[PDB]
Amino acid sequence: DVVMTQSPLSLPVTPGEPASISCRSSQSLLHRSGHKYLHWYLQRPGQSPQVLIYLGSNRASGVPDRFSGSGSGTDFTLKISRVEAEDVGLYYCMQTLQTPWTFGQGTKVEIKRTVAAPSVFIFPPSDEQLKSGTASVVCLLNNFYPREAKVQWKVDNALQSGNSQESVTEQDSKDSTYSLSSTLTLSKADYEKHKVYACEVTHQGLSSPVTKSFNRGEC
Amino acid sequence: QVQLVQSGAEVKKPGAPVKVSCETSGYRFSDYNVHWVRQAPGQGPEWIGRISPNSGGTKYAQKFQGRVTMTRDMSMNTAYMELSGLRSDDTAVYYCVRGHCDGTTCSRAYWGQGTLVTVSSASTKGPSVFPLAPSGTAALGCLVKDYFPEPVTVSWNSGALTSGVHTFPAVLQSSGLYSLSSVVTVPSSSLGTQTYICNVNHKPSNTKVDKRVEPK
């Protein structure tokens, strides 16, 4: 079997700067052909992975000449001569010298932009949801960087722990920010028992945490 | 043009089998191996096996020996992958792949679009869609709650509104059902004048909803 060793796992790069991803094979991937059986892909959730480079150094049609591949035998590189914001994503090398086909761990290219503080919004449960008997309170952190953020929920100043779920978008392909949604779940009965609903946000761009809140049922 | 198109998303209970098809056109089917690869959440890709069309010969990775059967029908230029005894960690996107070489020359691979197989005790259910109402710049959105399985698609104003939209990854609630939000930021000056509608489609339950979101 062939082990494929990819590095680095995370590649933060300033837009405009070059980038290089390494891939090492446990045995040479050359001449049963002419070719080196090493290929590079970009993961694309929802469809086929995009072939970038195939057979070592052949750039697929449509791929910008900013991308190139090289290597011989056991050590390969995928190079981006000038990284653009749209290049964010997850990149894999893989070998087909032998079956089973085997894959590198993957490299997440991240764009390093200036710090951007989140814009915070809070949404009460809709009257429609309340009529159905449930209550979801949603806190939105919009267009921030870097990704690290803490969201703390408070209900009449009681710290909520374990009652919320959050998820985060992939890095935006144009402005390189993230957005995050946190949902606090309560029974309608419990929602009606309380007044002050508060989302407290900690982020590098905020000197001190920001709290967005609302009082239940007040226009 | 070389084309490989797979059958649609599948949802199965643990213990059941699944059979995925890979229909091809635009090339000599007998000249290339067809490989199958999957990728599970939080995991790297995995090669499952391959079939050689001209001989029918199969080769499977050790992990799938005795679990997987690959077949093909030459008259239909189609390959199949059947995976039996499904478990929760068989939840993955499955791909068919035309091999690189035709026994004389080599070039790029061609991939199918993928087939999501969800393995779960849960039963298919449509989402409820709730507005996330606004009231300079305002945020609004839709909460798409308690559906199974993935995925749902969300657009805004039938695709006319894309700038500033964020549709978040679904979270799997403790009740085995998914929930997600989709939001957009808009000018407050437009609230009550410009209509904002989130178009939600959950094909597994054949649920399509156009929800207007209005300020409170």
Author numbering:
A (entry chain L): 1 to 27, 27A, 27B, 27C, 27D, 27E, 28 to 214
B (entry chain H): 1 to 52, 52A, 53 to 82, 82A, 82B, 82C, 83 to 100, 100A, ...
Paper text:
Binding of CBTAU-22.1 was found to be dependent on phosphorylation of S422 and, as seen for CBTAU-7.1, affinity for phosphorylated peptide was modest (32.7 µM). In Fab CBTAU-22.1, the CDR loop residues also fit the electron density very well, except for the more flexible CDR L1 residues 27d, 27e, 28 and 29. A disulfide bond is formed in CDR H3 between Cys97 and Cys100b. Similar to CBTAU-7.1, three basic residues, Arg50 and Lys58 from the heavy chain, and Arg27e from the light chain, are present in the antibody combining site, which display very strong positive electrostatic potential. Interestingly, two sulfates from the crystallization buffer can be modeled into electron density in the highly basic combining site. One sulfate SO4-1 hydrogen bonds with His35 and the main-chain amides from His96 and Cys97 of heavy chain, with Arg27e in close proximity. Another sulfate SO4-2 forms a salt-bridge with Arg50 of heavy chain and hydrogen bonds with Thr94 of the light chain, with Lys58 of the heavy chain nearby. Furthermore, Lys58 and Arg27e are somatic mutations from the germline V-genes. Thus, these sulfate interactions and the strong basic nature of the combining site, likely explain the recognition of the phosphoryl groups in the tau phosphopeptides. In contrast, CBTAU-22.1 immunostaining on AD brain tissue is confined to more dense or aggregated tau structures and shows comparable detection as obtained with the Gallyas staining of neurofibrillary changes.
Using a high-throughput, single-cell, screening methodology, we were able to recover a panel of 52 tau antibodies from the memory B cell compartment of healthy individuals between the ages of 18 and 66. Two antibodies, CBTAU-7.1 and CBTAU-22.1, were studied in more detail as representatives for antibodies with activity in the in vitro tau aggregate seeding assay binding to distinct regions of tau. Crystal structures of both CBTAU-7.1 and CBTAU-22.1 revealed multiple positively charged arginine and lysine residues in the combining sites that are likely to be important for the recognition of the phosphate groups in the phosphorylated peptide epitopes in tau, as in other structurally characterized anti-tau antibodies such as pT231/pS235_1 with phosphorylated peptide pT231/pS235, RB86 with phosphorylated peptide (416–430) and AT8 with phosphorylated peptide (202–209). Binding of both CBTAU-7.1 and CBTAU-22.1 was notably affected by ionic strength, which suggests that binding is stabilized by ionic interactions with involvement of phospho groups in both cases.
